[PDB]
Amino acid sequence: MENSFKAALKAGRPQIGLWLGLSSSYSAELLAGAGFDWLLIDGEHAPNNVQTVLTQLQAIAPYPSQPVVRPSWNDPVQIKQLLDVGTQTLLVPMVQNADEAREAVRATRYPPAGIRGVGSALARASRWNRIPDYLQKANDQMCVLVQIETREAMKNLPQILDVEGVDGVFIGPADLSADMGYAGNPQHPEVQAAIEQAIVQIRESGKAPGILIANEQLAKRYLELGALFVAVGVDTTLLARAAEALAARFG
């Protein structure tokens, strides 16, 4: 039950990822064999729920690619349910300040370190109580990544970075650009400056910066700067764009 993605971030090994919005355990398996370090199961902007997350985790399990799950919001109840089906790495949307970051962290940790409700017998998390001493080992293998997506969140970043248990900070360029006045198009100097400055500040605090970016040159730039969990594409886009290009070649 060692969290190898978390260990890698801690060791400063960059992790290359793919976003999964196809919401299917079948395509999840197909993509789990494609050579990515991590896969993001999106519960926020794709039609997933706890049950489809579970089946995608089962599909991915025997592959080297590590799963990360994004809940629909920073919700303790939804976090608890995701952890019980076996989620160990969470990407939490719209974290605006240190208090919200702390709530995310505590949602993942058993008392006294947190408020995670106990339900080990029922849960894939402990493999239905086959993992010995699960309750005592579980906290240290939880990896909490928080998303900063607004000017307010950027302003609060130093404080968010001071929250123990925050292992990484993810920047969402589309949401950030929208908040900043550029309508979801991050290719504006003011937006890139903010992103670059955040990546540096995060890495300087001893924590992992992350980002999703489909432009491969921008992705390489962010990696060169020091980002440690970079998603470089989205399943739905890869499929749609490859199919459209193919049809176009025949008229």
Place this chain on the structure above:
Amino acid sequence: MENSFKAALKAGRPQIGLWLGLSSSYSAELLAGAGFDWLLIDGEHAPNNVQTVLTQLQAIAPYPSQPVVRPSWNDPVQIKQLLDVGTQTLLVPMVQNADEAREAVRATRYPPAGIRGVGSALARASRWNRIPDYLQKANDQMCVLVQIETREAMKNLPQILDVEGVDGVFIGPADLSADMGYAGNPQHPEVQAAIEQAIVQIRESGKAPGILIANEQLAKRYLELGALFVAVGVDTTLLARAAEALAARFG
């Protein structure tokens, strides 16, 4: 991606609807061909979720009948997820005051006009980014309908009607009658008076009144008065009552 139901309400063309509680993409298609102007996919009182809404939207898509979705509550997160699978017309339950109406409207609109989170690449809403300039066109095709179901909501109606982006106000007679002391039976003079007065006030403000009513004479009365989105039956009731009547004719 033009919202034709919204255009019709704006133009004062009455829209006749059917309520869908069967929670099935198969019966949704069957009913999409029956000649209604709109169909209500009920996420509140029928066993639907974002995923079943998605499949019902897919089933209805090639038909002229327009889909409207009712979330379980006035919840920004649930609203965001519904919009991403392609929902453009929402019927929001238990809207009690202008602040709640405004939250519903802003949940549907991209910044700065609202707080809708961006996730276009992943979403059926933009047809996975095939709709050009989706981010810029999306706000104007969202149609927000709010439900008033209590005496408190009736008292606040003038203020609710002043909220920009509120395109229509739906009256739920059963909930209203319950709140007023008549136990969900709207056939009491005090309740009909309130309903009639609301329909008039709504239409006089330049907005669309709506209602669900299974009694066909009452429905015609409300249409005569000026209601613009009137649901005249419920799938489950049509099926149950037709089946029971049939069995009764044979003993």
Place this chain on the structure above:
Amino acid sequence: MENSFKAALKAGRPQIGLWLGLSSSYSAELLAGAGFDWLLIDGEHAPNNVQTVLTQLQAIAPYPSQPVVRPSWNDPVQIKQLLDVGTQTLLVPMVQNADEAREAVRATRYPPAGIRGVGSALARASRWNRIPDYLQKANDQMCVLVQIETREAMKNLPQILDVEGVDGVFIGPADLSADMGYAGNPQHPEVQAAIEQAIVQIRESGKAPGILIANEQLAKRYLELGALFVAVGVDTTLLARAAEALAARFG
């Protein structure tokens, strides 16, 4: 595990039925409360399989209406599977002769009386081996109804009626009329004559005649002639026609 539908036919008590093509456990429960004696789960012309039959049987179980299941064909493998999930009354399509009727009966009976494969520990049919002496009691509670749908089958009817274990013979007017050249409209004197002559002959042999007929006058005419399992409507039709009628009443 007494088959009450089977006992009713044997006692000459007419059974009024509804056809289920909505392929949903939810609408099946709704319809199970409507007052029919029997309900036909259609695995031939509706998108059902062994698994959806199972969920529909579970939904119907606490109600008085008795389930009957139609396999896609007279296939002993499919029959075995349907029996294991708890089917006790089968309506077998396209039975052309006495050998085929015999094959249907034998598919439902444990050796030596038939070729039904044994798997009671696994099966809802024995309630996972809770039903005492299941193996010894099962054969006698199976009820086999065979469909005659062609001129060939009509010619072989006397031999088919001589087959032990054939409890009922069902006439399918649409298929029969199509085979007879009146495709597929059964309102022609020569089709009605064939139908009515078969009903009389079936009942004369001491077996139960059955038919599906949405016209209530014809249904009563068939009952007068001795028909004992008469399906008088179809769920999809009831819903589609009620919905269309409603929408039309509002323009």
Place this chain on the structure above:
Amino acid sequence: MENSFKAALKAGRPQIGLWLGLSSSYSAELLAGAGFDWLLIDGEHAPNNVQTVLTQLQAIAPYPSQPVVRPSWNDPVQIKQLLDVGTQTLLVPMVQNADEAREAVRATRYPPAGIRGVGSALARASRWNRIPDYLQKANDQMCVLVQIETREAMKNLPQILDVEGVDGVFIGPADLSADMGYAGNPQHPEVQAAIEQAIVQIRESGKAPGILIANEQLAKRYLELGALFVAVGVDTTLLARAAEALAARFG
């Protein structure tokens, strides 16, 4: 629609239960025939949602075992949806004080006694309006059980017990032991003392104490003391432990 579990608790008849985390309508039916007085469908720590609850209720319906449902939290919206698919007995997690207990009770009751939204036509709860006078009978057959799982909740127990409509109080030993410093292992004298004292206080107030405990001697002790709804095992554990023991006997 009489709630027989509720009547039994009121009459002081102890009810022996099994916890269902397998989240399957198929295993639910299998277990519904095993002789338990009640079955707990766990929406909190197992991968269930309103839809899977519905199918499990349908599976259990014809059996004598009574269903109890645990929502993911004390959420009025989720409670409403569960009640509409037919839930009449709720086990509500993390109830910390009298105000929270009162919110749980009011979520289950139609106005004026509560805030339950009306949606009878659509709901299995009224059997799609076949239950006559459902709106007037529904409140009295709702049974609300609240979970106390923290030292804070224990402190507030006398006040929680004074809340009308609270029919029972369930103690979760694992969560309680975690809150008390013993890491989810309830076998510590301080924890057993607290549990024993709560069971007595609950029963002395005229209300039903409940608990889940897999140790059969502890369960018998709690029953001897006066507990009235005792779950004595969990489906997932029974299966896992029986399978592991079996494999071990062969090496």
Place this chain on the structure above:
Amino acid sequence: MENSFKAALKAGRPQIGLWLGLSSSYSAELLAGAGFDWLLIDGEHAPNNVQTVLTQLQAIAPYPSQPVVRPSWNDPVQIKQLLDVGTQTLLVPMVQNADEAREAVRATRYPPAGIRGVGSALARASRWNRIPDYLQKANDQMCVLVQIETREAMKNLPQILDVEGVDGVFIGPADLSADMGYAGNPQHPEVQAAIEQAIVQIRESGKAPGILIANEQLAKRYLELGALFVAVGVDTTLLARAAEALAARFG
């Protein structure tokens, strides 16, 4: 209910296609917007059944791309079921001779022209009896494409082309190459010769040649020779290879 794919082949307009093996209604919709003339829902080599074909047909329906469905074999029972859920164009595997081609055609046609069973009230195919004179118009809109996959089938090609109702003949290079001893690599002169000779001969007879070929140079070569339904890629391949390429570009 005009079959536009069928009309295009008859008019000599080449149709460019994509194979769908992802077995999902969600990715089917995504791909339906990509610009292909046709989409192949594979019931033979992908985990589809009648029910998933149905949901994929619903998803594709509002788009210009036309669905074609491949049953698992030339089985008249499976064909009947696929036709009832609305399939109008079938790609039938392993057709070895003219008798088997005739059997495929006849499975799709109502008597007297075939043996298709009647069940229009139940079926999406007639839109639940909304399509006027469905029974009279259906036969002419069925489009039957047969696969030749062995040396035996190649030998019988002239007789197969003489079968009325065979609208197209599809060559499966992998299966053919395997039968020819080059298992299963079709890049050998003798396989290419057999393929190209068949395409010429099929087109010469006035029927449509088809093929699946992921190599775009070969695809254009087959088009030059007169092939009229050419599938130029497979969804699972497009996704797997794009994902693998992306991951490799980042090390």
Place this chain on the structure above:
Amino acid sequence: MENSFKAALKAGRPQIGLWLGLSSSYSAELLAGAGFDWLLIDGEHAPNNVQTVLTQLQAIAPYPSQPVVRPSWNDPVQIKQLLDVGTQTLLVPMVQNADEAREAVRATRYPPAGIRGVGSALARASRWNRIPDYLQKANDQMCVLVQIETREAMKNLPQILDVEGVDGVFIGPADLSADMGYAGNPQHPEVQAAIEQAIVQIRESGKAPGILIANEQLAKRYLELGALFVAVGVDTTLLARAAEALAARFG
């Protein structure tokens, strides 16, 4: 893609197994961690299909227990489909003679050794063409186990054992006892004699004997005689009996 179950049988290492009839990917994972050498996914007597087999194979994949799948019959079309979703070991029911055993073997092998249809780009079996030289390596990793279930099959056992590619012969005691007139109780000396004589004869030929037997004393007796794949319990039975025992201990 080495078949380790197949290698174990060939090396004379007995494999202890559990039968899976719960038809759930969730309980399959739970049971995959219980310590059995193999797990039987039953497509004959449990409500599984190609799609639920797929999800169960995905769930079991990361565990040491090896899956074996039982098709509903010796059907080459069903076998092809199960092989494409990744099945490598098949337990084929009702194999009566050497021709039928040969047909089973040939259904699993690519030409020229068999008639297995080619579709690797689409199939989990090749991991969507990631497995290098899949077509060349697949045949040798297929493991075919045939069930002898009748006196006829027992008579033909010597010829069946002479069939190349038959790796194992499984005796089904319930079906065999039913065929022998002891329906379906296998505790009679003449049934036990037939069973034990077959086990000895199978092993003598250098092939693996198999059997399902819930009685642990009999299971050890069969192992002593040389049986090499012995299923020692059934999931549904384990769960039902443990639950019933528990409930009874509490009255």
